[PDB]
Enzyme design. Structure first.
Site, PDB file in Angstrom:
ATOM      1  CG  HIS A  77       6.136  -2.515  -5.626  1.00 42.11           C
ATOM      2  ND1 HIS A  77       5.698  -3.683  -5.041  1.00 42.11           N
ATOM      3  CD2 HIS A  77       5.013  -1.822  -5.947  1.00 42.11           C
ATOM      4  CE1 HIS A  77       4.380  -3.715  -5.063  1.00 42.11           C
ATOM      5  NE2 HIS A  77       3.946  -2.600  -5.603  1.00 42.11           N
ATOM      6  CG  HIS A 244      -3.751   0.346 -10.840  1.00 44.06           C
ATOM      7  ND1 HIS A 244      -4.389   0.319  -9.625  1.00 44.06           N
ATOM      8  CD2 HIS A 244      -2.494  -0.127 -10.617  1.00 44.06           C
ATOM      9  CE1 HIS A 244      -3.549  -0.167  -8.700  1.00 44.06           C
ATOM     10  NE2 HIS A 244      -2.362  -0.417  -9.271  1.00 44.06           N
TER      11      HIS A 244
HETATM   12  C1  HEM Z   1      -3.237   2.759  -3.419  1.00 46.83           C
HETATM   13  C2  HEM Z   1      -2.124   2.489  -4.121  1.00 46.83           C
HETATM   14  C3  HEM Z   1      -1.971   1.182  -4.806  1.00 46.83           C
HETATM   15  C4  HEM Z   1      -2.486  -0.069  -4.555  1.00 46.83           C
HETATM   16  C5  HEM Z   1      -3.244  -0.529  -3.312  1.00 46.83           C
HETATM   17  C6  HEM Z   1      -1.963  -0.927  -5.579  1.00 46.83           C
HETATM   18  C7  HEM Z   1      -2.227  -2.285  -5.702  1.00 46.83           C
HETATM   19  C8  HEM Z   1      -1.826  -3.194  -6.681  1.00 46.83           C
HETATM   20  C9  HEM Z   1      -1.973  -4.601  -6.591  1.00 46.83           C
HETATM   21  C10 HEM Z   1      -2.577  -5.364  -5.435  1.00 46.83           C
HETATM   22  C11 HEM Z   1      -1.483  -5.102  -7.796  1.00 46.83           C
HETATM   23  C12 HEM Z   1      -1.450  -6.547  -8.215  1.00 46.83           C
HETATM   24  C13 HEM Z   1      -0.149  -7.255  -7.918  1.00 46.83           C
HETATM   25  C14 HEM Z   1      -0.259  -8.619  -8.593  1.00 46.83           C
HETATM   26  O1  HEM Z   1      -1.150  -9.386  -8.054  1.00 46.83           O
HETATM   27  O2  HEM Z   1       0.470  -9.021  -9.610  1.00 46.83           O
HETATM   28  C15 HEM Z   1      -0.989  -3.987  -8.593  1.00 46.83           C
HETATM   29  C16 HEM Z   1      -0.527  -3.971  -9.906  1.00 46.83           C
HETATM   30  C17 HEM Z   1       0.017  -2.915 -10.526  1.00 46.83           C
HETATM   31  N1  HEM Z   1       0.125  -1.685 -10.006  1.00 46.83           N
HETATM   32 FE1  HEM Z   1      -0.629  -0.968  -8.344  1.00 46.83          FE
HETATM   33  N2  HEM Z   1      -1.389  -0.197  -6.561  1.00 46.83           N
HETATM   34  C18 HEM Z   1      -1.232   1.026  -6.079  1.00 46.83           C
HETATM   35  C19 HEM Z   1      -0.581   2.059  -6.675  1.00 46.83           C
HETATM   36  C20 HEM Z   1       0.143   1.945  -7.820  1.00 46.83           C
HETATM   37  C21 HEM Z   1       0.964   3.013  -8.393  1.00 46.83           C
HETATM   38  C22 HEM Z   1       1.278   4.331  -7.735  1.00 46.83           C
HETATM   39  C23 HEM Z   1       1.518   2.486  -9.572  1.00 46.83           C
HETATM   40  C24 HEM Z   1       2.399   3.102 -10.619  1.00 46.83           C
HETATM   41  C25 HEM Z   1       2.384   4.389 -10.968  1.00 46.83           C
HETATM   42  C26 HEM Z   1       1.001   1.127  -9.726  1.00 46.83           C
HETATM   43  C27 HEM Z   1       1.191   0.338 -10.825  1.00 46.83           C
HETATM   44  C28 HEM Z   1       0.795  -0.996 -10.939  1.00 46.83           C
HETATM   45  C29 HEM Z   1       1.026  -1.761 -12.139  1.00 46.83           C
HETATM   46  C30 HEM Z   1       1.573  -1.271 -13.453  1.00 46.83           C
HETATM   47  C31 HEM Z   1       0.534  -2.983 -11.878  1.00 46.83           C
HETATM   48  C32 HEM Z   1       0.439  -4.213 -12.774  1.00 46.83           C
HETATM   49  C33 HEM Z   1       1.380  -5.371 -12.621  1.00 46.83           C
HETATM   50  C34 HEM Z   1       1.548  -6.276 -13.791  1.00 46.83           C
HETATM   51  O3  HEM Z   1       0.998  -6.011 -14.924  1.00 46.83           O
HETATM   52  O4  HEM Z   1       2.218  -7.351 -13.543  1.00 46.83           O
HETATM   53  N3  HEM Z   1       0.104   0.896  -8.688  1.00 46.83           N
HETATM   54  N4  HEM Z   1      -1.322  -2.839  -7.917  1.00 46.83           N
END
Ligand code: HEM
Ligand code: HEM
Ligand code: CL
Ligand code: CL
Ligand code: NA
Ligand code: NA
Lengths: 713, 713
Positions: A77, A244
């Site tokens: 972010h 993810h």
């Molecule tokens: C279309 C693009 C993306 C969407 C819509 C998206 C959406 C989300 C959402 C909704 C969450 C959950 C937040 C929560 O409820 O705690 C999340 C978690 C996460 N996203 Fe994404 N994401 C996107 C791209 C990315 C990218 C580019 C990265 C990193 C390279 C990323 C890495 C993560 C990680 C590591 C988590 C896990 C959080 C945790 O374990 O607390 N995401 N994502």
């Protein structure tokens, strides 16, 4: 307390030009972050971060006993606000810790991640900035979990207040499109300079476009927003599937349980927000987005399991505990671990936007290649993660520390190394004299050097005269740069350069990049001389010439000036008044109100206008460096009226006779209109100001010439 | 463009502390206005201003051929925004040329007056400020029309942006009382710190209170607003009757004819406003207030005709050409000259507020005395005009030029001259040692010197430690100053002083003013020593002791700190949260956000709190100068909650054990809450910052001790 903004909500706002003053900065005037960071023991910080990943705090327990996923998210972010249109956002100033970003809904619970880092920030103090630390922590998270990163550069200095950024016009967090302040029009066209689908989101809606769970249509929003963050299809697939591979989302219970975001929370909250009434409010009961998805069987370890799942199962729509749309593999065994209960397992799940990677036809080809060749996936994600987290850092000369990657990447707008003696003061004087003897005019010299230097923007530190990219595609053909006049100037300068370099002994040579700037200096000096003043314009050599092969033409497109009030130029008709675009350009050039004022008044009388327009050329001695712009603008003997043919062009007529004296644009006349700008213009238009005008013009000219010279920092 | 202000309209705004930075200032860092003005040929300026009086411009023709009346009004409006409650407003910064004051309704057509002065400002440049020039022009107008002024001081430096001032909460210009943001409550009680009856007025409504033409009730508003601008009954009668000895009002046609105020006008208006569609829009047809009154038979000449008319006729209520209430003389002949037509004459007229001078019983006695004794009127008006136009200039040491009056006036809070050798570095070391040997504690020493120095306000440059007024009425009795503890410290200091002075040869002596500050320095030194640091605090001697007869007790009352977050002090419950009052105080003391932060964190651990309160004392080594406040405030091991008994007091408990560690107020905790202040706290609470903390504390301490030291400027 009623304010000027309330009474006159459409006046120009100059306070954006005076942010980041020495008053607001707690560090001393001589504090240099690069020097502090260069002595940081980076390896010791990384060991402390590694230990942190598995040291759970009870006030925000770690999922799976490992904070890695939370910190990857924090770091994506931090970097993910970046917009290629203006270079604003990104991780480079640590703006996630200030309003509004600290309280965006997409940043929910990232306050917790930042607070977990306070003991380490505290330990190392000024030697590591928050901005650097957010990114470093993301790298360490990845490394701790088995992923080989591409490298890391320090050098992001901390800032001390919120940047002024246009994030949209909506007055409601997350407002669906088509409202009274809709950021969309036409066939789903997102307005520039925006790069997210809804106010308070990083890129897209994880349920689908305005909440419609259609992976095919979500893919369109993904592609458009990622492109507006400078990422192509391959980099977007790599980054989303890469990210993810780790962690989980948080949606244990209804979101009405979650309280005020950090900037609205009670003082007792001590900078944290989103306090939740759902069960324990944290850990197993955490609510962040409202989705409840865990992607892989090993959420704390790098794997190729995201694509194994994505392609290995068929997916069915379901709802989270907050009613949000998400997807489940129903035919699957319960193979996914629970974040807190070792005796629970779960079926594989995916977001609508994850399935976009499989059901968009272009993404599916890339995702399949990554599924079949996870080594290629790992390399693409490492490169993309580096690009994501470094894209706003500027020239490679700003990169600090022992982990900087040696590979030079095209997106960095690279500048070749200089391997030869530089010109000295005597050589610069001989070159200025040859430039002046060639017959090139003050107008041509100043316009060319302005065109080369004024591409710089402080938001991501792209652009500037280093590289001589003005002679390359696409800059050589930009309308603002006057392609035919430009070509004639560059041809004469290149012949001067060839002759001078041909005469040298011992390796000495001058780059075209340096000579374009030096020639501009000679035009300013000549203009001063034409006004009866002897001045020396400072000049620093060391620029180098980049090749066409080292210049991504498509990435350059965002640097084209479509509005440049310093050249009285507007490429077409815009919704935003020309004066607002002028202050916007001043901000990108890092100029204060006084510097914008002196600079524009000088450029006007030097002949820097596009097309040789007379608008704002309020002098009878063009190409002499005088304060004539201000003296004539402020002369109450002249009366101004908008023209019948164009309301944005004004005629200045003698008040007694009616004789036509001048014409000008809104950019010219705002200096006689706005109460603050006119107070500035009055300083430079006073009888005692000829010397001040000249000195201040030369200083700001020099400042613009040097904006990208981080090699001299 | 949605902003932080929109999303979080009640968060604390720190940008008021970083106004007036070097970024916004067009003059260089070393520009010294006092030195520029000291070289101005003031006599030559005055000659040009005399010439201007009767050089009529066709775009705003002079009434009676003489601009004098217009310029007296301009100068009185410049000075007339001043409020004694906070010292904000007044003429001292030339704020009339910026928003909102340039566009207040009561300043209508003063844009024309200021534009008539552009040729003169331009000619003399940086050597005479706009702020000085507005007042000088007032003076010359008076002199041109036959009135001998009491004198003039230069030295008001120009400012470059709008000051942040609370002018009220109304969202409608000129809104009548009892609206949703009413500035009145109860029995016509005007809210502090306001000093005008309606938003956009200088003092009162010339038609009468909320437009009701009752001279007796208008008198009440006049007396209350003038008192809130530091003027008593005699000074108020003198100023109103003196001013209305000149010129005229402008109300030739309906006000619907008058267009946009300057900040709303089109760009082609070039900084002017109120363009009128009525006939020629100017001169004989001018519309400014909408009233049409000319007071005297010779509006361009000093006379005794105001009181002759006021008392010599009976008055009848009538309406101007814009429908406004005003008064005409019953049965009078047409004796008053027309401003443009030599063949017209008019009957005597008066404003409701002029008649207040006759129908209020207390004013009537003064006005009659002035009618019978015109020389007393002339002297009182000269004195009061000088007070009006100099009241916010600060100590006499700031007054520049050859026309400064030598008479010392009570309202100037005068400080006696120093006529004796000052103590040197050896004597200061000996005095500090005696202070430390007396048994005075760190807490006592620091609290006393804080109480003496922190009465300074930059708004009008009143207050500070010079004068030793802390030992006099009323400061010795202020609750914030802890009257009983203060008395015991001053008694010990006065014994030290008497012994030291008794032993000197030559005329060497130390003032109690100096010794209070020196003693505070010794306490800071001792505190640093208690923490293991070797620190010398700078000290500049030269303060003198003022007498009780040199200290107007009623005018001092506005300096009482009823809120002082630096001592964790709040005298009662207020509408405004305590953190807002803290930043207000910081502004008055001229502190940036980092200086406010360092200073408060130090004061807390030094024992400067009123009543020895523990609130915010986050250290186990009170009276040792350490960064403990910051390190402990930011400790995430501690959880904060509001107390049951008081929601504005907080308990900090160990998060694991539940043990009570600390208590704090909103002033304390805002540094751990507000995202910008917490970023500052983090710098001072880092492991590498103890030295920086100590150094920065001593710098801001010293700054506060020297705020009023214009004798060293
Ligand atoms: C279309 C693009 C993306 C969407 C819509 C998206 C959406 C989300 C959402 C909704 C969450 C959950 C937040 C929560 O409820 O705690 C999340 C978690 C996460 N996203 Fe994404 N994401 C996107 C791209 C990315 C990218 C580019 C990265 C990193 C390279 C990323 C890495 C993560 C990680 C590591 C988590 C896990 C959080 C945790 O374990 O607390 N995401 N994502
Ligand atoms: C109760 C206090 C006062 C009220 C309500 C008041 C009201 C006004 C108004 C309504 C006008 C007419 C503006 C126009 O239509 O052009 C005016 C003019 C003026 N007032 Fe006052 N006044 C007050 C006190 C003062 C003071 C203290 C001075 C100076 C010491 C002053 C000097 C002037 C002068 C010189 C003019 C004439 C301007 C010209 O000739 O264009 N008045 N006053
Ligand atoms: Cl930004
Ligand atoms: Cl002010
Ligand atoms: Na940026
Ligand atoms: Na003031």
């Amino acid at each position: 307390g009623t304010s000027n903004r309330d009474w006159w909500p459409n006046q120009l706002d100059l306070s954006i030009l005076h942010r980041h003053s020495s008053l607001s900065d707690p560090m001393g005037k001589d504090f240099n972050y690069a020097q502090a960071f260069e002595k940081l023991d980076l390896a010791a910080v990384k060991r402390d971060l590694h230990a942190l990943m598995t040291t759970s705090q009870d006030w925000w327990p770690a999922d799976f006993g490992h904070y890695g996923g939370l910190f990857i998210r924090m770091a994506w972010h931090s970097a993910g606000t970046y917009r290629t249109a203006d270079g604003r956002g990104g991780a480079g100033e640590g703006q996630q810790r200030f309003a509004p970003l600290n309280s965006w809904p997409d940043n929910a619970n990232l306050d917790k991640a930042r607070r977990l880092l306070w003991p380490i920030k505290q330990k190392y103090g000024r030697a590591i900035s928050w901005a650097d630390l957010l990114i470093l922590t993301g790298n360490v998270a990845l490394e701790s979990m088995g992923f080989k990163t591409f490298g890391f550069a320090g050098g992001r200095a901390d800032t001390w207040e919120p940047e002024d950024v246009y994030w949209g016009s909506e007055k409601i967090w997350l407002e669906l499109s088509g409202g009274p302040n809709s950021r969309y029009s036409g066939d789903r066209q997102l307005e520039n300079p925006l790069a997210a689908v809804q106010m308070g989101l990083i890129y897209v809606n994880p349920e689908g476009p305005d909440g419609n769970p259609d992976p095919v249509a979500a893919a369109r929003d993904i592609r458009d927003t990622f492109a507006r963050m400078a990422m192509n299809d391959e980099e977007t697939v790599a980054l989303i599937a890469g990210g993810h591979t780790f962690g989980k989302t948080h949606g244990a219970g209804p979101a009405s349980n979650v309280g005020a975001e950090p900037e609205a929370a009670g003082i007792e909250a001590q900078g944290l927000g989103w306090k939740s009434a759902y069960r324990t409010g944290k850990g197993a009961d955490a609510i962040t987005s409202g989705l409840e998805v865990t992607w892989t069987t090993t959420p704390t370890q790098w794997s190729h399991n995201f694509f194994e799942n994505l392609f290995g199962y068929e997916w069915e729509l379901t709802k989270s505990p907050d009613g949000a749309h998400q997807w489940v593999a129903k035919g699957a065994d319960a193979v996914i671990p629970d974040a807190f209960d070792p005796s629970k397992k779960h079926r594989p799940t995916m977001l609508t936007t994850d399935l976009s990677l499989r059901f968009d036809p272009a993404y599916e080809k890339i995702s399949r290649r990554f599924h079949e060749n996870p080594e290629q996936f790992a390399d693409a994600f490492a490169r993309a993660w580096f690009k994501l987290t470094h894209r706003d850092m500027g020239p490679r000369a700003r990169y600090l520390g022992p982990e900087v990657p040696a590979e030079v990447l095209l997106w960095q707008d690279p500048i070749p190394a200089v391997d030869h003696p530089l010109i000295d003061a005597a050589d610069a004087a001989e070159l200025k004299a040859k430039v002046l003897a060639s017959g090139l005019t003050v107008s041509q010299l100043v316009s060319t050097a302005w065109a080369a230097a004024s591409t710089f923007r402080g938001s991501d530190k792209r652009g500037g005269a280093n590289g001589a990219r003005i002679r390359l595609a696409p800059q050589k053909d930009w309308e603002a740069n006057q392609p035919e006049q430009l070509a004639a100037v560059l041809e004469t300068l290149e012949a001067i350069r060839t002759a001078f370099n041909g005469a040298q002994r011992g390796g000495k040579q001058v780059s075209l990049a340096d000579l374009i700037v030096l020639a501009g200096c000679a035009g300013v000096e000549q203009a001063a001389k034409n006004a009866g003043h002897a001045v020396t314009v400072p000049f620093a050599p060391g620029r180098a010439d980049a090749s066409q092969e080292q210049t991504d033409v498509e990435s350059m497109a965002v640097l084209e000036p479509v509005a440049d009030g310093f050249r009285n130029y507007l490429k077409g008709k815009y919704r935003v008044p020309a004066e607002v675009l002028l202050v916007d350009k001043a901000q990108l050039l890092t100029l204060s109100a006084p510097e914008m004022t002196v600079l524009l008044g000088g450029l006007r009388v030097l002949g820097a206008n596009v097309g040789q327009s007379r608008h704002g050329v309020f002098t009878a001695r063009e190409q002499a460096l005088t304060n004539d712009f201000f003296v004539n603008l402020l002369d109450m003997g002249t009366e101004w009226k908008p023209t019948a043919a164009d309301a944005d062009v004004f005629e200045g007529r003698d008040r007694a006779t009616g004789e036509l004296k001048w014409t000008g644009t809104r950019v010219d006349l705002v200096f006689g209109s706005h109460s603050q700008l006119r107070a500035l213009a009055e300083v430079y238009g006073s009888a005692d100001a000829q010397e001040k005008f000249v000195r201040d013009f030369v200083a700001v000219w020099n400042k613009v010439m040097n904006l990208d010279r981080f090699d001299l920092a």
